Design a protein around this ligand. Sequence first.
Ligand SMILES: [Cl-]
Ligand SMILES: [Cl-]
Ligand code: NA
Ligand code: NA
Ligand code: NA
Ligand code: NA
Ligand code: NA
Ligand code: NA
Lengths: 245, 247
Amino acid sequence: KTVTVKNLIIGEGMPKIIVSLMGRDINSVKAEALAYREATFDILEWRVDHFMDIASTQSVLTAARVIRDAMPDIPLLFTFRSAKEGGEQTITTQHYLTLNRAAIDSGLVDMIDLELFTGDADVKATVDYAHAHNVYVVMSNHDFHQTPSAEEMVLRLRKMQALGADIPKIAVMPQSKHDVLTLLTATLEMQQHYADRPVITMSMAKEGVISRLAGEVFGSAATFGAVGQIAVNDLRSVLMILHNA
Amino acid sequence: KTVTVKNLIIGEGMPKIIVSLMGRDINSVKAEALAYREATFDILEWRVDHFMDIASTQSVLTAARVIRDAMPDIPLLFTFRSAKEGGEQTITTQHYLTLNRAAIDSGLVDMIDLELFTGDADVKATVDYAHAHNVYVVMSNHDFHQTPSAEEMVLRLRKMQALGADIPKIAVMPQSKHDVLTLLTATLEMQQHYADRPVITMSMAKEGVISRLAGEVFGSAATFGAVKPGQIAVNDLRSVLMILHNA
Ligand SMILES: [Cl-]
Ligand SMILES: [Cl-]
Ligand code: NA
Ligand code: NA
Ligand code: NA
Ligand code: NA
Ligand code: NA
Ligand code: NA
């Protein structure tokens, strides 16, 4: 039930810490990667939707290459978060496909984030393309407005598994403390009944912070930190304390 | 609605850290009291049921006095945990009530722990006596075998409020991770619908540890740490509580 990338075992032990690059251009991305040398985390995510020149596949690959070469030994996750799912800018489905395929077949990334709701033909084709090139798929879904029912969330995570996700991922926005418990309930129901691979879940915002800390208990394999948001050192501290309790 | 004891506001801000002192005899209680001075926590609980001279009221009050003299400014909670609810030794109900009344009227302690199911008439009488002597009551219930339904837990916490508890407290044993969520659910239901005073809740054991850390989110006003299952090192507990508070 694990996914191993560059000696990192996702899906056992303590949840793994993901930090994200958000620079606009090559120099900005270089400066972030340099600053991140002083940090301790497990997975580097490039948030491509924060990059300015996403129109050129060449520009995107050149930046991916800079990042790959800046941190050659870190698991590298390529993520274009669509505006549709809370990201920073819009993209056509075809161009989203082009960028993901190019990242996959370039050898520059270990994992890609693929949004479940992209469309079935495109999701299946891109999953197959990733796997054929030895790239893992974090298949993702986000609701930045509200929290669906536990039943609906569990079905989405199960659907991601059925479609070949290596790591299903869901992130939802609480509108109450109750909604945080609903997210934890859905996570646990995956953990103990349907999951046969690692899953990542989160309740967003201040209210949902506990979901970023309690992954080892309820069944989320990774968590996002910052070099609602939580500093990576504080995150590490809590994860270790929980792991050794 | 809060409870303020020696400038500590229970029911606001970060959950308050309680540590338990457990010396078997007067010399050990003395030594522990002195050693605990350097640990950082909010409330000192004396676990009287671990004391092996409970036969003598004088011995018990002298031990309380030694703790008070070592820590004059700490909120001090006197707790005889009954054998029925998981404590170290069986004593008669009258003996239990006498020890609590003597603690109350001594002026040595700020709070007592009184078990909800001691009996309604005896609980009411003891609550009234505590209040007559400016002592707060942590009214408690335990299930060391299982986690009752969220509705049963809420029922008990509400009964504690009805009986005049200053701080209702429930501690239950998870048999699964699901049971930990049940305890958090009951805690939140109290917070948002029924509580009109601070409430302490916990899921015990290793599986329940997250409940000792997430009190600020779901509405538990205090949590137990260890100076030296589930009670983690007090410094680690404080670190996590601070990180959650400031996130
Ligand atoms: Cl294209
Ligand atoms: Cl995310
Ligand atoms: Na992507
Ligand atoms: Na879009
Ligand atoms: Na190819
Ligand atoms: Na007592
Ligand atoms: Na007893
Ligand atoms: Na009196």
